[PDB]
Design a protein around this motif. Structure first.
Motif, PDB file in Angstrom:
ATOM      1  N   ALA A   1       3.637   5.376   8.924  1.00  0.00           N
ATOM      2  CA  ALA A   1       3.842   6.784   8.633  1.00  0.00           C
ATOM      3  C   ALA A   1       4.703   6.921   7.376  1.00  0.00           C
ATOM      4  CB  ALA A   1       4.470   7.472   9.847  1.00  0.00           C
ATOM      5  N   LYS A   2       5.472   5.876   7.108  1.00  0.00           N
ATOM      6  CA  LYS A   2       6.343   5.867   5.944  1.00  0.00           C
ATOM      7  C   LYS A   2       5.682   5.063   4.824  1.00  0.00           C
ATOM      8  CE  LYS A   2       9.857   5.688   9.251  1.00  0.00           C
ATOM      9  NZ  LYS A   2      10.596   6.954   9.053  1.00  0.00           N
ATOM     10  N   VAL A   3       4.383   5.279   4.672  1.00  0.00           N
ATOM     11  CA  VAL A   3       3.624   4.584   3.645  1.00  0.00           C
ATOM     12  C   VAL A   3       2.890   5.610   2.778  1.00  0.00           C
ATOM     13  CG1 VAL A   3       1.693   3.008   3.266  1.00  0.00           C
ATOM     14  CG2 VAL A   3       3.472   2.437   4.959  1.00  0.00           C
ATOM     15  N   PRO A   4       3.521   5.939   1.619  1.00  0.00           N
ATOM     16  CA  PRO A   4       2.940   6.899   0.697  1.00  0.00           C
ATOM     17  C   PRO A   4       1.771   6.283  -0.073  1.00  0.00           C
ATOM     18  CG  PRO A   4       5.152   6.249  -0.058  1.00  0.00           C
ATOM     19  CD  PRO A   4       4.800   5.406   1.157  1.00  0.00           C
ATOM     20  N   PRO A   5       0.880   7.177  -0.580  1.00  0.00           N
ATOM     21  CA  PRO A   5      -0.279   6.732  -1.334  1.00  0.00           C
ATOM     22  C   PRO A   5       0.121   6.283  -2.741  1.00  0.00           C
ATOM     23  CG  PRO A   5      -0.373   9.133  -0.990  1.00  0.00           C
ATOM     24  CD  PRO A   5       0.953   8.629  -0.448  1.00  0.00           C
ATOM     25  N   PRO A   6      -0.736   5.407  -3.330  1.00  0.00           N
ATOM     26  CA  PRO A   6      -0.483   4.896  -4.666  1.00  0.00           C
ATOM     27  C   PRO A   6      -0.783   5.957  -5.727  1.00  0.00           C
ATOM     28  CG  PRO A   6      -2.422   3.799  -3.704  1.00  0.00           C
ATOM     29  CD  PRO A   6      -1.967   4.884  -2.743  1.00  0.00           C
ATOM     30  N   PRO A   7      -0.283   5.691  -6.963  1.00  0.00           N
ATOM     31  CA  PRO A   7      -0.491   6.611  -8.068  1.00  0.00           C
ATOM     32  C   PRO A   7      -1.927   6.525  -8.591  1.00  0.00           C
ATOM     33  CG  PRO A   7       0.981   4.807  -8.748  1.00  0.00           C
ATOM     34  CD  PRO A   7       0.490   4.511  -7.341  1.00  0.00           C
ATOM     35  N   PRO A   8      -2.347   7.607  -9.298  1.00  0.00           N
ATOM     36  CA  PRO A   8      -3.687   7.663  -9.855  1.00  0.00           C
ATOM     37  C   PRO A   8      -3.806   6.768 -11.090  1.00  0.00           C
ATOM     38  CG  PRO A   8      -2.550   9.778 -10.202  1.00  0.00           C
ATOM     39  CD  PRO A   8      -1.560   8.803  -9.586  1.00  0.00           C
ATOM     40  N   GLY A   9      -4.657   5.758 -10.970  1.00  0.00           N
ATOM     41  CA  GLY A   9      -4.870   4.825 -12.063  1.00  0.00           C
ATOM     42  C   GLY A   9      -4.702   3.379 -11.591  1.00  0.00           C
ATOM     43  N   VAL A  10      -3.529   3.103 -11.042  1.00  0.00           N
ATOM     44  CA  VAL A  10      -3.229   1.769 -10.549  1.00  0.00           C
ATOM     45  C   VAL A  10      -4.466   1.196  -9.856  1.00  0.00           C
ATOM     46  CG1 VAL A  10      -2.218   2.771  -8.467  1.00  0.00           C
ATOM     47  CG2 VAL A  10      -1.637   0.411  -9.142  1.00  0.00           C
ATOM     48  N   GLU A  11      -4.669  -0.099 -10.051  1.00  0.00           N
ATOM     49  CA  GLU A  11      -5.806  -0.777  -9.453  1.00  0.00           C
ATOM     50  C   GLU A  11      -5.340  -1.696  -8.321  1.00  0.00           C
ATOM     51  OE1 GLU A  11      -9.595  -1.755 -10.958  1.00  0.00           O
ATOM     52  OE2 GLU A  11      -8.926  -3.855 -11.280  1.00  0.00           O
ATOM     53  N   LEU A  12      -5.959  -1.517  -7.163  1.00  0.00           N
ATOM     54  CA  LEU A  12      -5.619  -2.319  -6.002  1.00  0.00           C
ATOM     55  C   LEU A  12      -6.708  -3.370  -5.777  1.00  0.00           C
ATOM     56  CD1 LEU A  12      -4.964   1.062  -4.680  1.00  0.00           C
ATOM     57  CD2 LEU A  12      -3.090  -0.560  -4.140  1.00  0.00           C
ATOM     58  N   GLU A  13      -6.274  -4.543  -5.339  1.00  0.00           N
ATOM     59  CA  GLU A  13      -7.197  -5.635  -5.082  1.00  0.00           C
ATOM     60  C   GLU A  13      -7.476  -5.753  -3.583  1.00  0.00           C
ATOM     61  OE1 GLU A  13      -7.338  -8.621  -7.772  1.00  0.00           O
ATOM     62  OE2 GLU A  13      -7.735 -10.288  -6.349  1.00  0.00           O
ATOM     63  N   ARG A  14      -8.758  -5.816  -3.254  1.00  0.00           N
ATOM     64  CA  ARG A  14      -9.170  -5.929  -1.865  1.00  0.00           C
ATOM     65  C   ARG A  14      -8.730  -7.276  -1.290  1.00  0.00           C
ATOM     66  NH1 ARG A  14     -14.783  -3.778  -0.135  1.00  0.00           N
ATOM     67  NH2 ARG A  14     -15.636  -5.311  -1.655  1.00  0.00           N
ATOM     68  N   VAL A  15      -8.405  -7.257  -0.006  1.00  0.00           N
ATOM     69  CA  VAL A  15      -7.968  -8.465   0.674  1.00  0.00           C
ATOM     70  C   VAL A  15      -9.111  -8.999   1.540  1.00  0.00           C
ATOM     71  CG1 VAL A  15      -6.279  -9.409   2.290  1.00  0.00           C
ATOM     72  CG2 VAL A  15      -5.559  -7.730   0.552  1.00  0.00           C
ATOM     73  N   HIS A  16      -9.907  -9.873   0.941  1.00  0.00           N
ATOM     74  CA  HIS A  16     -11.033 -10.463   1.643  1.00  0.00           C
ATOM     75  C   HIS A  16     -10.549 -11.103   2.946  1.00  0.00           C
ATOM     76  CE1 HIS A  16     -14.198  -9.292  -0.920  1.00  0.00           C
ATOM     77  NE2 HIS A  16     -14.870 -10.478  -0.980  1.00  0.00           N
ATOM     78  N   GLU A  17      -9.489 -11.889   2.823  1.00  0.00           N
ATOM     79  CA  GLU A  17      -8.920 -12.563   3.978  1.00  0.00           C
ATOM     80  C   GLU A  17      -8.947 -11.640   5.198  1.00  0.00           C
ATOM     81  OE1 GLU A  17      -9.031 -15.264   2.388  1.00  0.00           O
ATOM     82  OE2 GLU A  17      -6.950 -16.006   2.095  1.00  0.00           O
ATOM     83  N   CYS A  18      -8.607 -10.382   4.956  1.00  0.00           N
ATOM     84  CA  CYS A  18      -8.589  -9.394   6.021  1.00  0.00           C
ATOM     85  C   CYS A  18      -9.992  -8.797   6.147  1.00  0.00           C
ATOM     86  CB  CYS A  18      -7.530  -8.318   5.775  1.00  0.00           C
ATOM     87  SG  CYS A  18      -7.348  -7.267   7.263  1.00  0.00           S
ATOM     88  N   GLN A  19     -10.361  -8.491   7.382  1.00  0.00           N
ATOM     89  CA  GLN A  19     -11.668  -7.916   7.653  1.00  0.00           C
ATOM     90  C   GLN A  19     -11.811  -6.567   6.945  1.00  0.00           C
ATOM     91  OE1 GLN A  19     -13.016  -9.672  11.782  1.00  0.00           O
ATOM     92  NE2 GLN A  19     -13.898  -9.934   9.726  1.00  0.00           N
ATOM     93  N   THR A  20     -10.931  -5.647   7.310  1.00  0.00           N
ATOM     94  CA  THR A  20     -10.948  -4.319   6.720  1.00  0.00           C
ATOM     95  C   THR A  20     -10.683  -4.401   5.216  1.00  0.00           C
ATOM     96  OG1 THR A  20      -8.718  -4.196   7.387  1.00  0.00           O
ATOM     97  CG2 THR A  20     -10.221  -3.382   8.971  1.00  0.00           C
ATOM     98  N   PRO A  21     -11.172  -3.360   4.488  1.00  0.00           N
ATOM     99  CA  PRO A  21     -10.993  -3.305   3.048  1.00  0.00           C
ATOM    100  C   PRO A  21      -9.556  -2.926   2.687  1.00  0.00           C
ATOM    101  CG  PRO A  21     -12.403  -1.473   3.787  1.00  0.00           C
ATOM    102  CD  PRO A  21     -11.904  -2.212   5.018  1.00  0.00           C
ATOM    103  N   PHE A  22      -8.663  -3.890   2.862  1.00  0.00           N
ATOM    104  CA  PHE A  22      -7.258  -3.672   2.560  1.00  0.00           C
ATOM    105  C   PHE A  22      -6.957  -3.987   1.094  1.00  0.00           C
ATOM    106  CE2 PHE A  22      -2.680  -5.178   3.474  1.00  0.00           C
ATOM    107  CZ  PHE A  22      -2.208  -3.904   3.408  1.00  0.00           C
ATOM    108  N   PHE A  23      -6.496  -2.967   0.386  1.00  0.00           N
ATOM    109  CA  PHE A  23      -6.168  -3.120  -1.021  1.00  0.00           C
ATOM    110  C   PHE A  23      -4.653  -3.080  -1.239  1.00  0.00           C
ATOM    111  CE2 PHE A  23      -9.715  -0.141  -0.070  1.00  0.00           C
ATOM    112  CZ  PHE A  23     -10.766  -0.949  -0.375  1.00  0.00           C
ATOM    113  N   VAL A  24      -4.174  -4.039  -2.017  1.00  0.00           N
ATOM    114  CA  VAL A  24      -2.753  -4.124  -2.310  1.00  0.00           C
ATOM    115  C   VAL A  24      -2.559  -4.348  -3.811  1.00  0.00           C
ATOM    116  CG1 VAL A  24      -2.341  -4.954   0.036  1.00  0.00           C
ATOM    117  CG2 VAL A  24      -2.615  -6.601  -1.854  1.00  0.00           C
ATOM    118  N   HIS A  25      -1.347  -4.070  -4.267  1.00  0.00           N
ATOM    119  CA  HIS A  25      -1.020  -4.236  -5.673  1.00  0.00           C
ATOM    120  C   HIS A  25       0.497  -4.348  -5.837  1.00  0.00           C
ATOM    121  CE1 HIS A  25      -1.578  -3.943 -10.051  1.00  0.00           C
ATOM    122  NE2 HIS A  25      -0.573  -3.022 -10.021  1.00  0.00           N
ATOM    123  N   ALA A  26       0.930  -5.532  -6.246  1.00  0.00           N
ATOM    124  CA  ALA A  26       2.347  -5.783  -6.445  1.00  0.00           C
ATOM    125  C   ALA A  26       2.664  -5.732  -7.941  1.00  0.00           C
ATOM    126  CB  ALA A  26       2.721  -7.125  -5.815  1.00  0.00           C
TER     127      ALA A  26
END
Length: 136
Positions: free
Chosen positions: A30-55
């Motif tokens: 619930a304390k997870v805000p959405p990313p900014p417009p533009g930033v590119e997130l990479e999908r996490v194949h390892e995970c089943q669901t289309p989980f995108f992260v960007h550090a």
């Protein structure tokens, strides 16, 4: 080594009552805000669901970014716990974090050893995205 902001969340977790721990993992998401417009997130194949992260690190702090389509509670939960004890942290501390910093507590038993596989890739990945920041 793992930072406090995190160690605190974890420590607090292993300290908090299971029943609560569940509600906690939820709140986090619930304390997870959405990313900014533009930033590119990479999908996490390892995970089943289309989980995108960007550090990344802006100025002198780390910037965690997650995107959950199915808004999974177990997926977001972690994603949140990650930022919960990383968001704002350093690019070196976020890297000093092991791929199993949730073992010395009671998270694995929460996200199972499987679900972790994916959640993990998240860190590993991000950690791979940080290395760049170091020399970005």
């Amino acid at each position: 080594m793992v930072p406090p902001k995190l160690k605190q969340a974890l420590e607090l977790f292993k300290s908090l009552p299971k029943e609560l721990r569940s509600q906690v993992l939820l709140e986090y998401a619930a304390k997870v805000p959405p990313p900014p417009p533009g930033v590119e997130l990479e999908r996490v194949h390892e995970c089943q669901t289309p989980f995108f992260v960007h550090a990344d690190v802006e100025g002198g702090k780390v910037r965690l970014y997650f995107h959950v389509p199915d808004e999974a509670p177990t997926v977001k939960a972690f994603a949140g716990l990650l930022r919960e004890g990383l968001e704002g942290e350093s690019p070196e501390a976020v890297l000093e974090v092991p791929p199993g910093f949730y073992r010395g507590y009671g998270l694995e038993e929460f996200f199972t050893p499987l679900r972790l596989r994916g959640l993990e890739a998240a860190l590993l990945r991000l950690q791979a995205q940080v290395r760049k920041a170091l020399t970005s």
